[PDB]
Short mmCIF file of C-alpha atoms in Angstrom, two decimals:
data_model
loop_
_atom_site.label_atom_id
_atom_site.label_comp_id
_atom_site.label_asym_id
_atom_site.label_seq_id
_atom_site.Cartn_x
_atom_site.Cartn_y
_atom_site.Cartn_z
CA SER A 1266 -22.61 -115.39 -56.64
CA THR A 1267 -23.00 -115.68 -52.76
CA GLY A 1268 -23.63 -113.47 -49.74
CA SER A 1269 -22.88 -113.74 -46.23
CA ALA A 1270 -24.24 -111.31 -43.41
CA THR A 1271 -24.12 -111.40 -39.72
CA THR A 1272 -27.44 -111.20 -37.94
CA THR A 1273 -27.53 -109.77 -34.37
CA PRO A 1274 -30.20 -110.02 -31.62
CA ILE A 1275 -31.89 -106.66 -30.98
CA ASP A 1276 -31.88 -107.17 -27.23
CA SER A 1277 -30.86 -109.53 -24.40
CA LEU A 1278 -33.85 -111.79 -24.92
CA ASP A 1279 -33.43 -112.32 -28.67
CA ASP A 1280 -36.73 -110.81 -29.41
CA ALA A 1281 -35.79 -110.32 -32.93
CA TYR A 1282 -32.51 -110.37 -35.16
CA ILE A 1283 -31.31 -107.59 -37.25
CA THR A 1284 -29.03 -107.79 -40.34
CA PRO A 1285 -27.41 -104.83 -42.10
CA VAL A 1286 -28.55 -104.36 -45.66
CA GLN A 1287 -27.13 -101.77 -48.32
CA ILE A 1288 -29.85 -99.93 -50.26
CA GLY A 1289 -29.19 -97.44 -52.96
CA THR A 1290 -26.26 -95.51 -54.42
CA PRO A 1291 -24.28 -94.37 -52.36
CA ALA A 1292 -25.12 -97.30 -50.01
CA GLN A 1293 -27.67 -96.51 -47.25
CA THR A 1294 -27.29 -99.09 -44.67
CA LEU A 1295 -30.47 -100.10 -42.77
CA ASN A 1296 -30.74 -103.04 -40.10
CA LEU A 1297 -33.50 -105.17 -41.19
CA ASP A 1298 -35.53 -108.02 -39.79
CA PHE A 1299 -35.19 -111.01 -42.17
CA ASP A 1300 -38.51 -112.55 -42.08
CA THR A 1301 -39.09 -116.11 -43.55
CA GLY A 1302 -42.68 -115.62 -42.79
CA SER A 1303 -43.40 -112.63 -45.03
CA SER A 1304 -42.50 -111.48 -48.61
CA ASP A 1305 -42.19 -107.57 -48.51
CA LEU A 1306 -38.86 -105.77 -48.20
CA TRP A 1307 -40.06 -102.58 -46.48
CA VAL A 1308 -38.22 -99.73 -44.86
CA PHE A 1309 -38.50 -96.67 -42.66
CA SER A 1310 -37.98 -93.77 -44.93
CA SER A 1311 -37.99 -90.00 -45.55
CA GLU A 1312 -41.63 -90.60 -46.45
CA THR A 1313 -42.72 -92.14 -43.04
CA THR A 1314 -44.92 -89.97 -40.97
CA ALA A 1315 -42.70 -88.07 -38.74
CA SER A 1316 -44.42 -88.83 -35.42
CA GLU A 1317 -44.00 -92.52 -36.17
CA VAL A 1318 -40.28 -92.37 -36.51
CA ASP A 1319 -38.49 -92.86 -33.20
CA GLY A 1320 -34.74 -93.59 -33.61
CA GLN A 1321 -34.87 -95.77 -36.61
CA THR A 1322 -32.49 -95.15 -39.59
CA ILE A 1323 -34.42 -94.20 -42.70
CA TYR A 1324 -33.87 -94.80 -46.41
CA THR A 1325 -34.11 -91.53 -48.34
CA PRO A 1326 -34.65 -92.46 -52.08
CA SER A 1327 -34.05 -88.83 -53.36
CA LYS A 1328 -30.32 -89.25 -52.17
CA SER A 1329 -29.99 -92.62 -54.25
CA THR A 1330 -29.02 -92.14 -57.79
CA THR A 1331 -30.31 -95.66 -58.63
CA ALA A 1332 -33.72 -95.14 -56.89
CA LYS A 1333 -36.78 -95.14 -59.24
CA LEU A 1334 -40.34 -94.61 -58.10
CA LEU A 1335 -42.39 -97.73 -59.20
CA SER A 1336 -45.30 -95.58 -60.53
CA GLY A 1337 -48.68 -96.37 -58.96
CA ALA A 1338 -47.51 -98.92 -56.82
CA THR A 1339 -48.49 -99.25 -53.13
CA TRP A 1340 -48.26 -101.74 -50.39
CA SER A 1341 -49.99 -102.62 -47.05
CA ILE A 1342 -49.19 -105.57 -44.78
CA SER A 1343 -50.51 -106.64 -41.36
CA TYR A 1344 -48.54 -109.26 -39.47
CA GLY A 1345 -49.68 -112.10 -37.01
CA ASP A 1346 -48.75 -110.03 -34.05
CA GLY A 1347 -51.28 -107.27 -35.00
CA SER A 1348 -48.52 -104.84 -36.30
CA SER A 1349 -48.87 -103.11 -39.87
CA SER A 1350 -47.32 -100.72 -42.19
CA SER A 1351 -47.87 -99.47 -45.75
CA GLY A 1352 -46.70 -96.84 -48.26
CA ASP A 1353 -45.36 -96.72 -51.72
CA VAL A 1354 -42.64 -98.38 -53.81
CA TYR A 1355 -39.15 -97.78 -55.31
CA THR A 1356 -36.77 -100.06 -57.20
CA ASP A 1357 -33.17 -99.60 -56.09
CA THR A 1358 -30.00 -101.68 -55.65
CA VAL A 1359 -30.02 -103.83 -52.60
CA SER A 1360 -27.03 -105.68 -51.24
CA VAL A 1361 -26.77 -108.17 -48.47
CA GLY A 1362 -23.43 -109.47 -47.21
CA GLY A 1363 -21.86 -108.84 -50.62
CA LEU A 1364 -24.68 -110.28 -52.67
CA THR A 1365 -26.31 -107.50 -54.93
CA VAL A 1366 -29.80 -107.39 -56.48
CA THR A 1367 -30.57 -104.46 -58.94
CA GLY A 1368 -34.18 -103.39 -59.43
CA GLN A 1369 -35.21 -104.81 -56.03
CA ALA A 1370 -38.55 -103.53 -54.95
CA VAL A 1371 -37.87 -101.35 -51.80
CA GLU A 1372 -41.20 -100.64 -50.15
CA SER A 1373 -41.10 -97.11 -48.52
CA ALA A 1374 -43.32 -96.67 -45.38
CA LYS A 1375 -45.56 -93.82 -45.22
CA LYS A 1376 -47.24 -95.22 -42.08
CA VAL A 1377 -46.10 -97.84 -39.50
CA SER A 1378 -48.01 -99.06 -36.42
CA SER A 1379 -46.86 -98.20 -32.88
CA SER A 1380 -44.91 -101.47 -32.32
CA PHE A 1381 -42.62 -100.61 -35.22
CA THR A 1382 -42.28 -96.94 -34.00
CA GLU A 1383 -41.41 -98.03 -30.47
CA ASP A 1384 -38.72 -100.51 -31.74
CA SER A 1385 -35.89 -98.20 -32.61
CA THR A 1386 -33.55 -101.18 -33.52
CA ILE A 1387 -35.58 -102.32 -36.54
CA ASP A 1388 -35.31 -100.20 -39.60
CA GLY A 1389 -37.78 -102.42 -41.58
CA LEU A 1390 -38.22 -105.92 -42.79
CA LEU A 1391 -36.76 -108.19 -45.47
CA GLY A 1392 -39.18 -110.94 -46.49
CA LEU A 1393 -38.05 -114.42 -47.30
CA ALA A 1394 -41.33 -116.34 -47.67
CA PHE A 1395 -42.67 -117.08 -51.17
CA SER A 1396 -43.17 -114.07 -53.61
CA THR A 1397 -46.83 -115.00 -53.78
CA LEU A 1398 -47.41 -113.40 -50.43
CA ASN A 1399 -45.92 -110.01 -51.62
CA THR A 1400 -48.46 -107.23 -50.94
CA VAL A 1401 -47.51 -104.79 -53.69
CA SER A 1402 -50.49 -103.67 -55.85
CA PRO A 1403 -51.37 -103.49 -58.76
CA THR A 1404 -48.05 -105.39 -59.85
CA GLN A 1405 -46.90 -107.98 -57.22
CA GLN A 1406 -43.00 -107.74 -56.56
CA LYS A 1407 -40.36 -110.45 -56.04
CA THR A 1408 -38.44 -110.98 -52.80
CA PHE A 1409 -34.66 -110.39 -52.57
CA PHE A 1410 -34.07 -114.16 -52.58
CA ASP A 1411 -36.42 -114.82 -55.66
CA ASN A 1412 -34.51 -111.88 -57.54
CA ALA A 1413 -31.09 -113.24 -56.59
CA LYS A 1414 -31.82 -116.83 -57.00
CA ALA A 1415 -30.90 -117.38 -60.67
CA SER A 1416 -27.27 -115.71 -59.91
CA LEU A 1417 -26.70 -117.82 -56.92
CA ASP A 1418 -24.09 -120.62 -56.88
CA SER A 1419 -27.03 -122.79 -55.36
CA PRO A 1420 -30.67 -121.66 -55.00
CA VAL A 1421 -30.56 -121.56 -51.36
CA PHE A 1422 -30.32 -119.45 -48.14
CA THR A 1423 -29.30 -120.50 -44.71
CA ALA A 1424 -30.44 -119.17 -41.31
CA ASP A 1425 -27.97 -119.80 -38.41
CA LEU A 1426 -29.48 -117.75 -35.51
CA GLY A 1427 -27.60 -117.37 -32.26
CA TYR A 1428 -28.92 -117.88 -28.66
CA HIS A 1429 -27.95 -114.54 -27.05
CA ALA A 1430 -25.17 -114.15 -29.63
CA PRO A 1431 -24.79 -113.06 -33.29
CA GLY A 1432 -25.36 -115.59 -36.16
CA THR A 1433 -25.29 -115.68 -39.90
CA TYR A 1434 -27.61 -115.49 -43.04
CA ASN A 1435 -25.82 -116.94 -45.99
CA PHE A 1436 -27.05 -116.94 -49.56
CA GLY A 1437 -26.02 -119.23 -52.42
CA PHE A 1438 -24.02 -121.86 -50.36
CA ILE A 1439 -24.13 -124.11 -47.52
CA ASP A 1440 -21.43 -123.55 -44.98
CA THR A 1441 -20.37 -127.16 -43.96
CA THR A 1442 -18.55 -126.05 -41.09
CA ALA A 1443 -21.54 -124.37 -39.42
CA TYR A 1444 -23.26 -127.50 -38.19
CA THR A 1445 -22.57 -130.81 -36.69
CA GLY A 1446 -23.62 -134.14 -38.22
CA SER A 1447 -25.81 -134.13 -41.25
CA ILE A 1448 -28.49 -132.01 -42.60
CA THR A 1449 -31.97 -133.76 -42.82
CA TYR A 1450 -34.25 -132.45 -45.53
CA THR A 1451 -38.00 -132.40 -45.31
CA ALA A 1452 -40.88 -131.57 -47.74
CA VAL A 1453 -42.22 -128.05 -48.06
CA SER A 1454 -45.69 -126.97 -49.11
CA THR A 1455 -45.91 -123.52 -50.72
CA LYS A 1456 -49.60 -123.53 -50.84
CA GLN A 1457 -49.95 -120.80 -48.18
CA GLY A 1458 -46.86 -118.82 -49.33
CA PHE A 1459 -44.83 -120.06 -46.34
CA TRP A 1460 -41.84 -122.47 -45.70
CA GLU A 1461 -44.49 -125.03 -44.48
CA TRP A 1462 -43.41 -128.47 -43.37
CA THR A 1463 -44.49 -131.23 -41.03
CA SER A 1464 -42.45 -132.08 -37.98
CA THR A 1465 -42.59 -135.82 -37.01
CA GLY A 1466 -42.96 -135.28 -33.31
CA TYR A 1467 -41.59 -133.94 -30.05
CA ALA A 1468 -40.17 -134.84 -26.61
CA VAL A 1469 -40.10 -132.81 -23.44
CA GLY A 1470 -36.75 -132.98 -21.49
CA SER A 1471 -35.55 -136.60 -21.20
CA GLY A 1472 -38.98 -137.86 -21.91
CA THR A 1473 -39.95 -140.42 -24.64
CA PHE A 1474 -40.40 -139.07 -28.18
CA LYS A 1475 -44.07 -138.77 -29.25
CA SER A 1476 -44.45 -139.55 -33.03
CA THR A 1477 -47.00 -137.24 -34.29
CA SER A 1478 -47.32 -135.00 -37.39
CA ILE A 1479 -47.20 -131.28 -36.54
CA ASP A 1480 -47.70 -129.05 -39.72
CA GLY A 1481 -46.13 -125.66 -39.16
CA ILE A 1482 -43.97 -122.80 -40.79
CA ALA A 1483 -40.27 -122.03 -40.28
CA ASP A 1484 -40.51 -118.32 -39.47
CA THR A 1485 -37.44 -116.25 -38.48
CA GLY A 1486 -39.61 -113.32 -38.04
CA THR A 1487 -41.58 -114.84 -35.01
CA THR A 1488 -39.79 -114.82 -31.69
CA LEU A 1489 -41.35 -117.83 -30.08
CA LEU A 1490 -42.35 -121.47 -30.83
CA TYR A 1491 -46.19 -121.81 -31.29
CA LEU A 1492 -47.39 -125.33 -31.15
CA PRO A 1493 -50.78 -127.16 -30.55
CA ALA A 1494 -52.27 -126.86 -27.05
CA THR A 1495 -51.72 -130.51 -26.26
CA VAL A 1496 -48.00 -130.08 -26.90
CA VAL A 1497 -47.60 -127.11 -25.02
CA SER A 1498 -49.56 -128.37 -21.99
CA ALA A 1499 -47.28 -131.40 -21.95
CA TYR A 1500 -44.23 -129.13 -21.85
CA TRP A 1501 -45.30 -126.78 -19.20
CA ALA A 1502 -46.64 -129.67 -17.08
CA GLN A 1503 -42.98 -130.48 -16.32
CA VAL A 1504 -42.33 -127.04 -14.79
CA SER A 1505 -43.62 -126.75 -11.25
CA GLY A 1506 -45.77 -123.65 -10.83
CA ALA A 1507 -46.11 -123.01 -14.61
CA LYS A 1508 -49.57 -121.88 -15.82
CA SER A 1509 -51.42 -120.19 -18.64
CA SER A 1510 -52.22 -116.64 -17.62
CA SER A 1511 -55.00 -114.99 -19.77
CA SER A 1512 -54.00 -111.69 -18.28
CA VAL A 1513 -50.43 -111.96 -19.34
CA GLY A 1514 -51.38 -113.73 -22.69
CA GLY A 1515 -49.79 -117.02 -22.39
CA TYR A 1516 -47.74 -119.68 -20.32
CA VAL A 1517 -45.64 -118.07 -17.48
CA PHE A 1518 -43.45 -119.88 -14.95
CA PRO A 1519 -41.60 -119.11 -11.85
CA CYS A 1520 -38.33 -117.38 -12.73
CA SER A 1521 -36.61 -119.74 -10.15
CA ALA A 1522 -37.37 -122.66 -12.43
CA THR A 1523 -34.84 -124.72 -14.34
CA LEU A 1524 -36.62 -125.40 -17.71
CA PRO A 1525 -36.52 -128.64 -19.48
CA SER A 1526 -35.30 -128.95 -23.07
CA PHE A 1527 -37.88 -129.35 -25.97
CA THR A 1528 -37.02 -131.87 -28.85
CA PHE A 1529 -38.76 -131.55 -32.26
CA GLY A 1530 -38.55 -134.18 -35.00
CA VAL A 1531 -37.22 -133.60 -38.56
CA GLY A 1532 -37.88 -136.89 -40.46
CA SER A 1533 -35.99 -139.47 -38.36
CA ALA A 1534 -33.75 -136.59 -37.00
CA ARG A 1535 -34.06 -134.76 -33.73
CA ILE A 1536 -33.38 -130.99 -32.80
CA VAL A 1537 -32.98 -130.27 -29.31
CA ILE A 1538 -33.96 -126.72 -27.96
CA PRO A 1539 -32.12 -126.23 -24.59
CA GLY A 1540 -34.38 -125.25 -21.66
CA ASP A 1541 -32.54 -121.91 -21.34
CA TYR A 1542 -33.74 -120.94 -24.91
CA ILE A 1543 -37.42 -121.13 -23.67
CA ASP A 1544 -36.80 -118.43 -20.97
CA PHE A 1545 -38.08 -114.93 -22.01
CA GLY A 1546 -37.59 -113.36 -18.59
CA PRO A 1547 -39.78 -111.45 -16.29
CA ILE A 1548 -43.03 -110.46 -17.46
CA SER A 1549 -42.45 -106.87 -16.27
CA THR A 1550 -39.48 -105.38 -14.73
CA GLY A 1551 -38.75 -106.91 -11.41
CA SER A 1552 -41.31 -109.67 -11.62
CA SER A 1553 -40.64 -113.23 -10.53
CA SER A 1554 -43.06 -114.48 -13.09
CA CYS A 1555 -41.14 -115.17 -16.41
CA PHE A 1556 -42.65 -115.52 -19.84
CA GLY A 1557 -42.53 -118.82 -21.71
CA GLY A 1558 -40.90 -119.29 -25.09
CA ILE A 1559 -43.38 -122.22 -26.07
CA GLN A 1560 -46.94 -121.01 -26.35
CA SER A 1561 -50.05 -122.28 -27.94
CA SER A 1562 -50.95 -121.77 -31.62
CA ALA A 1563 -54.71 -122.32 -30.82
CA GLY A 1564 -56.41 -119.54 -32.37
CA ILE A 1565 -53.46 -118.42 -34.58
CA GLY A 1566 -54.63 -121.01 -37.17
CA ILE A 1567 -50.91 -122.14 -37.77
CA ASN A 1568 -48.03 -123.70 -35.80
CA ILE A 1569 -44.94 -121.53 -36.00
CA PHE A 1570 -41.32 -122.74 -35.59
CA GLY A 1571 -40.08 -119.23 -34.62
CA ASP A 1572 -36.75 -118.16 -33.42
CA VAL A 1573 -36.91 -120.37 -30.32
CA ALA A 1574 -36.83 -123.47 -32.58
CA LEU A 1575 -34.80 -122.21 -35.47
CA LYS A 1576 -31.92 -121.02 -33.38
CA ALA A 1577 -31.29 -124.45 -32.13
CA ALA A 1578 -30.45 -125.57 -35.65
CA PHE A 1579 -28.70 -124.86 -38.81
CA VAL A 1580 -31.59 -124.33 -41.26
CA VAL A 1581 -31.44 -124.60 -44.96
CA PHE A 1582 -34.17 -122.87 -47.08
CA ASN A 1583 -33.70 -124.70 -50.33
CA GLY A 1584 -35.50 -122.78 -53.23
CA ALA A 1585 -34.85 -125.36 -55.87
CA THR A 1586 -37.80 -126.01 -58.32
CA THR A 1587 -39.33 -128.08 -55.67
CA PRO A 1588 -38.47 -126.27 -52.39
CA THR A 1589 -37.45 -128.20 -49.25
CA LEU A 1590 -36.21 -127.43 -45.81
CA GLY A 1591 -33.11 -128.61 -44.13
CA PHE A 1592 -32.31 -128.89 -40.37
CA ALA A 1593 -29.02 -129.96 -38.74
CA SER A 1594 -27.91 -129.63 -35.09
CA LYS A 1595 -24.91 -127.22 -34.38
#
């Protein structure tokens, strides 16, 4: 089997991407944030504290003839950005782009933090990291991909995120029309539960490539590119007037600037992030200070190849017995 679904930016800055997901019988379609940095499929629901729901579409398990309470199971998750959610668990039928999993754990939120409430466009998350990170207790549950894997034509999914435009998540096949040149595959460590890999270096604009190992994670659920302070300083030094602002929370730059590109290495291959992808617009409405899309990972504890990086590539998440990651230009 295969599946193919369009993923759409939630706003004009590509702050996140949403993908429609069918849950239950008859189908209830919710727009979920596909997150290769976590491993829970959770949704706003009829059980979510009413004051914490503001415009989201909810899953109502009592209206699904295939929903079953997973007795005694609870979940609770906290994300890198400080947001969180928790609740109980149902199993139900879940379909993405024509690919159907029966008995998928659907984690129903009883509580969500303010950032989730305040984002009316995201109805929940669909985790695509390794199932070892799943938070369901006392019986850990499998991701949608893990459940689908054996049925797929090939044990892979691909992320093809757009810049200020829709893109695609495919399951079970590689669309050879969706990228240019070849896909370069690179080793993955699953030791931390992530799609963790090692970039071979970087360049800023038209500058020379610096060969240096950068361990980090391919994370579709993180907006920005978080890299070591040395790398980030080298990038922003090429933008007149750019500075790190403790008050704002990262590097900012004059909105009048033209940003240089940023290249990262994948083995001997190179992925080029155009300068415009690194512009996250005014820090507040009407400001001429703009927020940067490349930020320091110092004190995160891990480097994160988030959407800024991934949307410059066609990315293969290869879930073979020994997983790997593939990157192509597009």
